[PDB]
Specification:
The PDB classes it as immune system. The complex is a heterotrimer. By secondary structure, chain A is mainly β. Chain A has helices spanning 123-127, 183-187; strands spanning 8-11, 17-22, 32-36, 43-46, 60-65, 68-73, 82-89, 96-98, 102-106, 115-119, 131-140, 146-151, 154-156, 160-162, 166-167, 173-181, 192-198, 201-207. The chains are: A mainly beta, B mainly beta, C mainly beta. Chains A and B meet through strand 3, strand 7, strand 8, strand 10 and strand 11 of A and strand 5, strand 10, strand 12, strand 13 and strand 16 of B. The complex binds a molecule of 5 linked components (NAG-NAG-BMA-MAN-FCA).
């Protein structure tokens, strides 16, 4: 049993966002709606098609007719971004399923250029016969970046490990990239650079093995 | 106040079994059912099954029926989920949640949720982290403000938590999600933004906790010297 | 009106 949801719905601030949920036995069974925001347990926002739990804002409402249930967020705000799942039982009533899930995006949020913080290998790590460069990217929006590494003036891909971007609490995004080197590699280049490209512009930070501050 | 406290993170080898617990308090345990829910990293919610806290009857989703046993112990007010014959693809976060529905309840649905339990499955063995300081250089400040941090390198499994000065510093802290490397080991970093004039005179320590390895590290982060 | 399912083998009409 599948409860079909649109993968994405976008809404402008103050507008009404609608998330649908289609299933063959919704005519006989109640729908429930869960909100899951970054890194947290789901929260019940609507139950039994159209009832609202205490403490849930009045701008959340639900309805269900035929084989489709709908969650409505009136006057959507930035804090309403997240993943929304409907839920209901199959025909037997012995099993629940969650719907395929909908990511709600609120449009019009301010663009934010990435902060890039680049650390060379610590002397402690080098004295342990290892070396890691750490490039930390925070507070950017929208949440897509590309990260490239250079040694002197040549691209480097070997030893690079980069995360996907993840939504911070303040609704901007963060990511990190690591370049693992031997101490010999580290000392044998004039510098290394981490290049972060975001919305067509690039912030590049450089470090050098002669810099001991 | 309803409270559901799940057991802590686990790592298992393929073919092992794991029994997660969910301790309930603040309500009559036998009046309500308990759901169990799985969420693989970056994926959706999957309902696994549920059990009556009272009469102990269970039902399981098609996917997990025959692979899991949900049980309850009323005298310990706890629900249990056992997952048998784990494989690496089973790695996920698992939630318990109380069903609020009842003949004499005005509400239904999973109102109250546990905090989640991470279970990692791998043939690799546990490895504690190597913690190194990230000291800001004079070229790397941002005016009256400077970023310093700790590198938590090459550990397994998740999770790791980081605090600063035993929690005396929280507002300037940014702890970044870990990268999973080709070696199968994790690394993460935490930075705290502090006054630039404080660097040579204030003490900064990152407190790293890796419960899967029973390891805690307090790493002092000193200004770059040379 | 609809059937509310509150547990394994436990359900009722509202
Ligand atoms: C949680 O609520 C229970 C009530 O049930 C609730 O959930 C179910 C599913 C349903 O929705 C109900 O509508 C709802 O109300 C409470 O259950 C109560 O449990 C007590 C047990 O402590 C029971 O008490 C009676 O005890 C009598 C004495 O026991 C005898 O045992 C010996 C046997 O040989 C005997 O020799 C000895 O001398 C002793 O006298 C016993 O006669 C009787 O049969 C009961 O067991 C209550 O009846 C029961 N209540 C109901 C309405 O059934 C439960 O206590 C509560 N839990 C908490 C922690 O609050």
């Amino acid at each position: 049993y599948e409860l079909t949801q649109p993968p994405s719905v976008s809404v402008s601030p103050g507008q009404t966002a609608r998330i649908t949920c289609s299933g063959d036995v919704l005519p006989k069974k109640y729908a429930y709606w869960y909100q899951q925001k970054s890194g947290l347990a789901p929260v019940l926002v609507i139950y039994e098609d159209n009832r609202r739990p205490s403490g849930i804002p009045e701008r959340f409402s639900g309805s269900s007719s035929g084989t489709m249930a709908t969650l409505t967020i009136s006057g959507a705000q930035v804090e309403d971004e997240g993943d929304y799942y409907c839920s209901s039982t199959d025909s037997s009533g012995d099993h629940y399923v969650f719907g395929t899930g909908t990511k709600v995006t609120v449009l019009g949020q301010p663009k934010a250029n990435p902060s890039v913080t680049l650390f060379p290998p610590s002397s402690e790590e080098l004295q342990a016969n290892k070396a890691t460069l750490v490039c930390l990217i925070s507070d950017f929006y929208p949440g897509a970046v590309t990260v490239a590494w250079k040694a002197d003036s040549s691209p480097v891909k070997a030893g690079v490990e980069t995360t996907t971007p993840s939504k911070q609490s303040n609704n901007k995004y963060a990511a990190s990239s690591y370049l693992s080197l031997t101490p010999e590699q580290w000392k044998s280049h004039r510098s290394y650079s981490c290049q972060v490209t975001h919305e067509g512009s690039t912030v590049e930070k450089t470090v050098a093995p002669t810099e001991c501050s | 106040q309803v409270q559901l406290v799940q057991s802590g993170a686990e790592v298992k080898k393929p073919g092992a079994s794991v029994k997660i617990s969910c301790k309930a308090s603040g309500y009559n345990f036998t009046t309500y059912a308990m759901h169990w829910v799985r969420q693989a990293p970056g994926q959706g919610l999957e309902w696994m099954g549920w059990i009556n806290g009272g009469n102990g009857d269970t039902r399981y989703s098609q996917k997990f029926r025959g692979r899991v046993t949900i049980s309850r112990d009323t005298s310990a007010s706890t629900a249990y989920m056992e997952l048998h014959s784990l494989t690496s693809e089973d790695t996920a976060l698992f939630y318990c949640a109380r069903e609020s529905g009842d003949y004499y309840s005005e509400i239904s649905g999973a109102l109250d949720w546990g905090q989640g339990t991470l279970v990692t499955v791998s043939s690799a063995s546990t490895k504690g982290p190597s913690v190194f300081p990230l000291a800001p250089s004079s070229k790397s400040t941002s005016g009256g403000t400077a970023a310093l941090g700790c590198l938590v390198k090459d550990y397994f499994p998740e999770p790791v938590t980081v605090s600063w000065n035993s929690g005396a510093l929280t507002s300037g802290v940014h702890t970044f999600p870990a990268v999973l490397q080709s070696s199968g080991l994790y690394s993460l970093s935490s930075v705290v933004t502090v006054p630039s004039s404080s660097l040579g005179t204030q003490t900064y320590i990152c407190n790293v906790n890796h419960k899967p390895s029973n390891t805690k590290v307090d790493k002092r982060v000193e200004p770059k010297s040379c | 009106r609809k059937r509310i399912h509150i547990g394994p083998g436990r359900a009722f009409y509202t």
